[PDB]
Amino acid sequence: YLDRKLLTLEDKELGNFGTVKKGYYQMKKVVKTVAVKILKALKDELLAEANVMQQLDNPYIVRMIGICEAESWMLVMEMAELGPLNKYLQQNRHVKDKNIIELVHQVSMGMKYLEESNFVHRDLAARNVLLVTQHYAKISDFGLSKALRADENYYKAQTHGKWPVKWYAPECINYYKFSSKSDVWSFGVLMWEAFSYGQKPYRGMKGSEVTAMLEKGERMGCPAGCPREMYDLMNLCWTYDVENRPGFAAVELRLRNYYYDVV
Ligand SMILES: Cc1ccc(Nc2nc(N[C@@H]3CCOC[C@@H]3N)ncc2C(N)=O)cc1
């Protein structure tokens, strides 16, 4: 646990869990710049999110510093100063396609780690990818994440809150089953987002209309300027049948070979 007197918070909001604030945390002889999730049943969720983060250790996943019991419960994390990927790309339209390939490949490496560790993320979107630099992305926001049982390859949802339906695979919507393959679908949407410079997917559509469109075999179009091979990978990620859709090992390898082949 973290001592509250060693933590200082700026009061400007960076971002229903509550708010995210920037702060500084004195660690031995220095200060560390931190991002802090502040709580506005809900106590258990933050401590659950912290318990998932504590278990993960990978260069493409945000590192948690610790939790802080003070005026409210707080999850203290290493600050990713460039912020959410979607917003960055909205404000930086000059970013080159090789640079976007590099960043989504990094997300796929982090997700391959998550899949090996038998964790489902359940909220994989461009808003939950954080940029440490313009060439270094990290996955964050493990508020819906679950550690799968040793003998199971999906989490069965009981709790039916407000879901990020536009990022969810058909099996999550129709049967409430969330697997790593379900995260691969989300990853496809994240890729569409990245090459669309942070535009919202399925613009102006209700979740129910998105579900109808997908059942017809329809999918989002190729974003302007997107390499063909990356649009193709998006379509593979959006394979309707779970057994036919690739896992993250296959997805990361495809991105890795394509990225390394760029001249
Ligand atoms: C503008 C800005 C800069 C840094 C961050 N940092 C983080 N944000 C989150 N969560 C956010 C919740 C609101 O929606 C956007 C984000 N998903 N989580 C972790 C960090 C971090 N460790 O830096 C947010 C906004």
UniProtKB/Swiss-Prot annotation:
Protein name: Tyrosine-protein kinase SYK
Ligand binding (ATP): 14-20, 37
Residue numbers bearing the Phosphothreonine modification: 19, 159, 211
Assembly description: Interacts with LYN; phosphorylates SYK. Interacts with RHOH (phosphorylated); regulates mast cells activation. Interacts with NFAM1 (phosphorylated); probably involved in BCR signaling. Interacts with VAV1 (via SH2 domain); phosphorylates VAV1 upon BCR activation. Interacts with GAB2 (phosphorylated); probably involved in IgE Fc receptor signaling. Interacts (via its SH2 domains) with CD79A (via its phosphorylated ITAM domain); the interaction stimulates SYK autophosphorylation and activation. Interacts with FCRL3. (Microbial infection) Interacts with Epstein-Barr virus LMP2A.
Active-site residues, as the UniProt record annotates them: 123
Source taxonomy: Eukaryota, Metazoa, Chordata, Craniata, Vertebrata
Organism: Homo sapiens
Domain remark from Swiss-Prot or TrEMBL: The SH2 domains mediate the interaction of SYK with the phosphorylated ITAM domains of transmembrane proteins. Some proteins like CLEC1B have a partial ITAM domain (also called hemITAM) containing a single YxxL motif. The interaction with SYK requires CLEC1B homodimerization.
Disease implicated: Immunodeficiency 82 with systemic inflammation: An autosomal dominant immunologic disorder with onset in early childhood. It is characterized by recurrent infections with various organisms, and multi-organ inflammation that manifests as colitis, hepatitis, arthritis and dermatitis. Patients have a propensity for the development of lymphoma, usually in adulthood. Disease severity is variable.
Tissues where the protein occurs: Widely expressed in hematopoietic cells (at protein level). Expressed in neutrophils (at protein level). Within the B-cell compartment, expressed from pro- and pre-B cells to plasma cells.
Residues of the full protein shown: 364 to 634 of 635
Function (record text): Non-receptor tyrosine kinase which mediates signal transduction downstream of a variety of transmembrane receptors including classical immunoreceptors like the B-cell receptor (BCR). Regulates several biological processes including innate and adaptive immunity, cell adhesion, osteoclast maturation, platelet activation and vascular development. Assembles into signaling complexes with activated receptors at the plasma membrane via interaction between its SH2 domains and the receptor tyrosine-phosphorylated ITAM domains.
Subcellular localization: Cell membrane; Cytoplasm, Cytosol
Domain of life: Eukaryota
